[PDB]
Each structure stands twice: as C-alpha cells, then as structure tokens.
Please model this.
Amino acid sequence: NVWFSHPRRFGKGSRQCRVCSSHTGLVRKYDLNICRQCFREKANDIGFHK
Amino acid sequence: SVQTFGKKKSATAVAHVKAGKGLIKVNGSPITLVEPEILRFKVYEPLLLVGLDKFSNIDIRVRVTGGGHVSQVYAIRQAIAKGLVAYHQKYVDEQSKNELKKAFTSYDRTLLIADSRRPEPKKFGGKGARSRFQKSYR
Amino acid sequence: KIRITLTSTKVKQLENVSSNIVKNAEQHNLVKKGPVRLPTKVLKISTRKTPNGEGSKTWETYEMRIHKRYIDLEAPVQIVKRITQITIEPGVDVEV
Amino acid sequence: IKLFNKWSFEEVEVKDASLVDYVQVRQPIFVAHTAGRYANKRFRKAQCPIIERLTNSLMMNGRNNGKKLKAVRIIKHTLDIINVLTDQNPIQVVVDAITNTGPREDTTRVGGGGAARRQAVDVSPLRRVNQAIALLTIGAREAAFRNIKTIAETLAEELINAAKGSSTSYAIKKKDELERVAKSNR
Amino acid sequence: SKKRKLVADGVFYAELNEFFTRELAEEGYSGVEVRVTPTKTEVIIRATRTQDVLGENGRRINELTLLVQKRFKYAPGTIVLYAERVQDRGLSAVAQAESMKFKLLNGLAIRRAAYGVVRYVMESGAKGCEVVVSGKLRAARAKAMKFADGFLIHSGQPVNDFIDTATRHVLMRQGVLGIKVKIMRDPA
Amino acid sequence: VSVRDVAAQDFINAYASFLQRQGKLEVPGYVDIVKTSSGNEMPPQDAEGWFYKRAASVARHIYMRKQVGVGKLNKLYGGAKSRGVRPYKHIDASGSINRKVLQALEKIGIVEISPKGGRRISENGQRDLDRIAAQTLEEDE
Amino acid sequence: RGMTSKPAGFMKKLRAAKLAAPENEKPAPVRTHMRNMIIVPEMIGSVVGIYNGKAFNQVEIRPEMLGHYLG
RNA sequence: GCGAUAACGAACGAGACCUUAACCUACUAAAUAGUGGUGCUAGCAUUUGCUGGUUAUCCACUUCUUAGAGGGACUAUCGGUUUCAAGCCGAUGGAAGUUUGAGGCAAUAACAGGUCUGUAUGCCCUUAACGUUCUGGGCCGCACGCGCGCUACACUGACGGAGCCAGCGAGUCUAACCUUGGCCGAGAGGUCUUGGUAAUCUUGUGAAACUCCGUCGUGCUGGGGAUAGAGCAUUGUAAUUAUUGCUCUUCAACGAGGAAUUCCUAGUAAGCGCAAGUCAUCAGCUUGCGUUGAUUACGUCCCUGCCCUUUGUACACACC
Model:
C-alpha cells in the first residue's frame, strides 16, 4: 500500500489514514481520521480545529 | 463639530454637519459625481425637508464606505437626518425628530429610525421573506 | 513600539496578566499607548455532529475562542526589560 | 403626496368613497398609480393601481426576471407617456380603474376532496387593492408571453379597457366572474 | 497561540496519553495536565498511589520521563514529569470507574458492584453519584442498569455543579463491556 | 475643473479626439483585428480604433487611483477572473496592449515611473486630462 | 504538449527498440500498455501493443506518424 | 399560567444559564481611514482660491470595528374584551416585542433500528495461503427502468460598449498566498526577480443581479447548446482509458411536458453572484455568506402524521 515511502511515480503513494486504512477524502490539516469520520469524534475528545 | 452615524444593509455613514458654506462633499468628490445615476435625489432629500432650502444654509461633508447605490443613498440620508436633531441653532434642533418621523408619514419606516433591513436569503417551510403569509384581509 | 501580544483560553487568566503589565512594566519611565482589547482570534464553523453516515438532521456549532489582547509598549527604554519578572499564568501564550 | 416631484393627489379626483377612508395617499396604502415600461419604447397610456402594491403582485408575476430593480423603471418611465398622449395625470385615470377591477364581494374556495365549494365572503377596501393588481399582472404576464407584445405595451393598453368597461380587458372581466358567483351562491 | 503547526503539539498530547494509560494503570490513572512552555511540557501525572510511581529511591519516575521522550512514536522536547497524588478515591469518577470495571472483570456481579460504590462516594462527600452499567448485566443480553444516589440523574440540570465524567472498558471472555460514571461534587 | 466634474464615458471620448492629434501615440494594430471580424458595428464613440480611446481610459485611471503598476492599469489591480488572468506567466492579448500604451504616453511626458514599482501621472499628463474636462463641462451646462 | 525542454519519452521502450529492431522485425504483436511515451523513429515497423480496455486493435507504425504520443 | 378539587409539596425534562446577531454608553484602546502641525504630486485660473488622488513617523483631533464590563423588553405602560382571573386583541415608547431572530439542549424508553469497513471485541473460521508484493484493466461499462440535481424552450430576454456596489472566510515554518517587470506564444502552464503580508497586505470594486443607450423583431432565429475536427508549455513523471479551458468551425433534442407528484409559513424558499471544505490534480456536490425580494388562511370539511379525554375489543413474541 501507500505507507511505503518509495512509490513508482510521483503521483501512486497518495494519502491514507493512521487509524483505519481508509482513503476516501481525508484531511490536509490532520493526516489522521478515516475520511470525515474521526474528525467529529476527535473533536469530542479534546479541542477543535477548523 | 457635530457628527453622527446611520447605517442600513451594512454601511458607515460618517456625516459631519457644520455652519458656513453648503457644498456637499461625499468622501473626496461632490454629490453629483459620486452618485451619477437616478436615486441620488435621496441624499438631497432631508435637506430641503426641514423648511428652508440648503446650499445657503448648512455645510455637509460625509465619508462613506459600505453600501450599494440602493443602500448608500439611504445611509448618507439617515446620517444627515440623525445629525440634524443633534445640531445647534438658537432655538436649536431636537423637535425635528418628529418631522423626520413625519417624513415617511403614517406608515412609519421613517428617517428618524433606521431601515432595519439586511437582505439575506429566502426561507424553508410555507412561503416566507418579511411580512407574514396568508391573509384574506391584507 | 515594541510589540508584545498576549493570547489565552478564556477571560480569567487573561485579566491578571494584562493588568499586571500596566502595573509592573508601566510606571513613569514607560509610556504605553495602552491596554487595548481587540476582537478575539476565534475560528468558528457550523458543521454536522454525526460525521457522515446515518442522519443528515443533526448539527453542531464549534468555536475556538482564543482571547487576544495586544497591549503595546511604546517607550523602548530601561523598563522594557522588567517584563521578565512576570512569568505567572501558563496557558497565557506570550509572544514578542 | 408628490410622486416623482411633479404629480400629486391634489390634482386627482377619487371615485370610490370607502377607499378614501381606508387607503390614504400619505403612505398606508399609497394612492399613486403608474406602471407599463420595459426597455425604451414610448407607446401610449400608462397606468397600474397603487404603487405600494406594485412592489407586491406586479413584481413577482412581471413578466420579468429580477425583482424590484426591474419594477422601479416600469413604474417611473411610463409617467411621461400618458402625460403627452391623453394629457392626463397618470394617477387619475386608473383611480377610475381600481374600483372596476376590485370586487365588492368575492368567493373563497374550500376543497372537500375533488369538490370546489365556492361560498361568498365580503371584501371592502383593503383586499380590493392587491387582488385587483394580482388580476392585472396575471393577465399581463401571460399576454406578454403568449403573443408578441412586451410587458410595456400590455400593462399600458389594458387599463383604459378596464376603466371604461370592455370584454377585451382581463381584470374587469375576472372581477365580474368572482363577484357574480358570490351574489349567486350566497 | 500557534497559528501554524497545531498537528505537531496536538498529536504529542495523544502520544503522552497512550503512555500513561498502559504504564500508570495499577498506580491508579486519572489524567495528565500538559501545560506547554516552549520546548517543555509539564506532564503532571496524577496517580492514586505515587509511592510506586516514584518507586525505590525514585527509579521509576526517572524511567517514565526517559521513555515518554523516546521509545517509539514520541518527540523529545527536553520535558519534565511530576507525580502528583489524587486526593480521595471516591470523588474522582475516573478512579472509581476504573475500580468498578476491575471488579466486573475479576468475578463480582453487577449489583454488588453498583450498590457498593455509590455508598462510598456519598460517605466521602459529593452530591450525587450515577453508576450506569450497560452491556451484558452478569452475562445476558444487552441493556442498561442505572441506579444513582443523590441529585444526579441525567446531569441534574446544566448550570454549575462540577461533574467528573468517565468511561472505561473491560476485555473478558463473554465480550467487551463498558461503563459510564458521573460524580457530582459541589457547584463550581 | 478636475476629471471628476466631467462624466466617465464622454470624457474618454473627448480626450480621445486630442489624443489622435499627438503623434507619439500610434495604433500597433490589434483591435482592427477583432471588431470587424465579429459582426459588431460600433458607431464613432463606441467604435474605438483604438489606442486613442483606450489611452484616454487608462490615463483617467491614474487620476482616479494614481498608484503604481502597468499591470495595475492592465486588467484594475487583481481581479481578472472576468476575461482572463495573467500575473506571473507570459502576458497575453491584454498584456501587449497596456505595456505599449503607457510606454507611448511616457514619450510625451504624460506618465512617469515612480520608484516603488511603476507608474504615476505627471505634469503634462494632468494638463491634457483636466483642461479637456473643462471644455466638456461648459458644453454640459 | 511536451516538445520543448524534455519530451516525455519513457526510457524503458528505448531499450526495447534498440534490441528488437536491428535483429529481425518481430511479426507477433509485442504488448506495450505504456501510453505515456513520445514515439521515435526506431519504433517504425515493429508492432507495438497498446491496450484499450476490453480489446486490442493492431498497430502498423508508419514513418509519417512521429511527433505524437501513443494516443 | 390562573380558578376548581382528598390532596400537599417536590424531582428529571422544558421556559434561563451558555453562544451568536439587533442597539445604547462611560473608561482604558489595536488595526484601518480622514484632517492638521511639514503635507506630497498635479491641474484649472491673471491671482485670490477651488477641485482630485495618494501616503510615513511622533503627537493631537474626528471616525469605524471588537472585547473586558455595565444595561435594555417585563404584556412594563394605555384602551377594549373576558367573571373586575389567567389570556387575547391592538396601540404607545424605541434600535428591537410578547421565550425578539438563529444556534445549543434531545427526558424516560422502545424500534432484538443501523454501524464487526473507525477503533474496540466474544466466538466461529481460513493459514505453501479468504496473507503480501509487482503491474495492467475494472469502478466511466450497456439493449432499459427509477430517484435527485444542472441547463434550456426566451424580448421573462439575447448581443456590444460604458458605469455603480456587499458579506462570511482562506494564505509554508523552512515547498505559502499574491503585487510587480520582461521574454516564449493557438490553449490547460513555472524557473527567476522585486515588494507587501503573517495576516495591516492579498485574494475581490478586471463582484453579478442591476442601470443607461443602441441593435435583433418572433422566425427553431440574433434562441438553445451536446458532439466532432482542426495550431503549444525549461514543470504537475505524465493526462489515449479518465483533466479543465481558449479561438475558428459543427449548430441536435427542445418551441412549457399526460397519469401523477414534491417543495416553498416572513429576511431562513425564488432569483442572483461570492467564499470555504476535501485537494499534487477534475463540482453542477457538500458547507458558509451577502445583495434585490414578494402573491397569499376566510377556514380546519377532506387527506397524512402527532397529542389529550371519552369509547368498543375475543386484541398482548410486543401489540405485521
């Protein structure tokens, strides 16, 4: 998958989540979060960000 | 000097009212030049309303930012009116409140009080905007 | 102008540190242009509470109310050094 | 009062007596009447009743896209046309037409399934204004669409046929329709 | 402040929490306060027993502060660490929720869990103590058992009441089972 | 008077008449390859053939705003989301018009270059504006 | 298109062409699903085998075509 | 909420606390604008003077915005109705009325409601492989049906030129946003230089609706736009499959839509632009914003959902 730091071309190794493997529209500001899903969960944990 | 405020639909009408001269300066250009279109009789409106005519009488210098040709012509107007009641003569100027209330008379969305209107969108659930739905007797 | 800026979480820690700079740093040898308020360095947004999935009918408004004060110190003489005495209230992020 | 700093109501004769009491030319409800222009064409006539309610029904029906910004040019620029054509006050001619297009007694509908129960209700002044202007504009917007005619010429021609009385007019004809069914099913 | 990288310091707080959930478990975990000075976090960890956190001549407090800076997924900083005591046991909901779940795991039933702990909290002080035990009540099917002492049933008004909140889990042969505990102290 | 007293459109037309008299401003021949290849008939005010009417507009904007940039007299300053933006990358149709116009006006002494980037408007410039503004104002009254 | 300053000719197929051309023209279609290459004069003759999706549809590469990509 | 009453007091909800918009004000004031102390640049004019745009440092004066804080609206005050109750109805005062507008709050429980693809996790399983890696092709297929958005059938206007105007939000910490100056050149497009901004600058008055005036004159057109073919980039490896877009050229369906059906309750739909979110890179979507802004309730008969009392029951695995 993506987490190997040498893809073939520049743009292959895209973005992935840390928590899940999931891919489908992540966040630039926080490289974690499934897609949208842990954005509101980890807001309810502590703090917020835009 | 005597100054005052007066906004509608977002505006900052910084209307100075002063004795001597009677040129209407809007920012850094005269009245006819800033507003060349059709609605610019409104900025000349509360001037002649008080009884006597202007140009001979009182000097007006406004600054204004914020507001379209629909908004600005009321913002400047409202500030000239709100600064009229706060002005000084010899009898003085407080009861011109009632005659600026009698400007747009008997359905009082006047020139003493503001057009408290900020045109934002259209609503969900029935038919809606401002002035409530469904009446035979309207 | 020697630009000091303060920013913290809420009001309670902010009042003490702001007033202390007027008391401690300022005296006679310092003239400040003074202790101002300013708008908050806030970031608000309305989004949905459930993050996508079941329920479009759910909402949650958010903010990050991070209350800034500027409080600028004008005269750059001897007394601009004595700010090192106040180190109280962590949670206040001092930035110079 | 003075409408576009020339024409007033002091040079205007009023027809219907109960509309004097209720609708006042001060501001509630403003008895100055004029509409019928789009683009640049000086046709003939003018006329459309109560300027406060030309912000109302006349706006949305049109026929025009755009709201009040359109409407204020429709109102303003037609004033000069009737002034040199019939040589009248643009308000006076359609103070005749407003009572002809406004019913005295109307009918409500209530829908009990697929049954239209038209029963009589009384009107009197206030509703007669806006429902009449609704009758003018619905006939005008459809007559601009369905045959080659702009909203300028449609609104203009209509109201002398409405004022005097003709079956060419939409608004006096639908006033008749709604009024006579009330006095029948009463 | 921090306009720029919030995903620098923000993720470091989470890494620190994952340390003391595992490490400071038996010593009696409650929470850590991490006030940030530039390149120095506070890391005032709060244990019920601080005698073990220090250890024999302060060996374990030296161990913890070294390992939380570097082992796997940690930033250095050159930070400090302080071992502070939790005052009482009953008033803290995070400390009580931990001990309730240990009893459930061990082999004590849900009624001899809930009724025993609410009495202890009302004895030390508090205002109300709600102990809602969800999941499989002594092995069964899912649902809740509430039961509370005092004024603490569904918050008990918003205002100012100072409610300590907690959630804790159990792994057991049966299934994963949780608990939600609220303990109200005094209006503040 | 000043350029404010006279109207917007008709000043640009009036000034354009005197602009054609001065033989520093030539047509490099761009807009005769657009308006004819269209269908568009534009009568003599609207017409613009072309460097005369466009120079009168551009020079009026250095009275009305005055601060620097050939680029900030090309497109107003930023917003060329209408019609086509061009800032860093190689300049297009709009580019080769306005770099030429302020170059040609400089060979008169209408515009000068001020040291914080680009253009201002100088002595013979505002003479050639507001003196013509007076003549038009006398025809308006 | 990439013409000025480095045209996008993928270096693996230059190694293919220098091998297969000076021997004998290979009458079997060599599969070459690489789309992103500039076509060069040492590819003339030999049947290159770009995929489409469900099928293939035989190349005869002519000396007139050179300038484009495989497109 | 007020009367009546074998009850009297109280708790969890809800009306308030909190957050945001409407407005006033003393005191301390940051960034911005204007004006003066020295202005600076320039015109028009014989001169006096009058007119325009720009902008720093220190101080003064005038202003605008926010936040610490102090208030304001309570059916308070007045008239009519009602048992001279509670309430309604309208009016006065004001920037603002009957919890002011919009968020935030979701009781007790049920639907064995949905999520084992977020993580956590009982147990079942599979393990030279329902593991892992390489690359291509698929997810864009198709011969029809259904649901939701976008755009048009127009003078409701189109086309050309000129002109006036808003608000919410973004922008490296060592790959930013962007002003400038010249050079390739049919487009999508950055190496380099200079200047501002950490948000004072910049995206944004090259911001539409709209307005002025002229032309077309109701014809598949000057309507509408799918589709195809024809000229390129010192980088984003690179856009046949599968990118948007710019000029010439191609100029369809369509000329207001049956049975039937949905949404739109007073600045929060229509109509109209503008900005954010994911993002190396593909919006008509999602999310947020301002500008211009109204037709219509007499009345609950019928329809659908929900609440209370009374009422019939053989109904009870949840009342299929």
About this structure: Residues 11, 14-15, 18, 22, 33-40, 43-48, 52-54, 59-61, 63, 65, 67-72 of chain C lie near RNA strand H (CB under 10 Å from a C1').
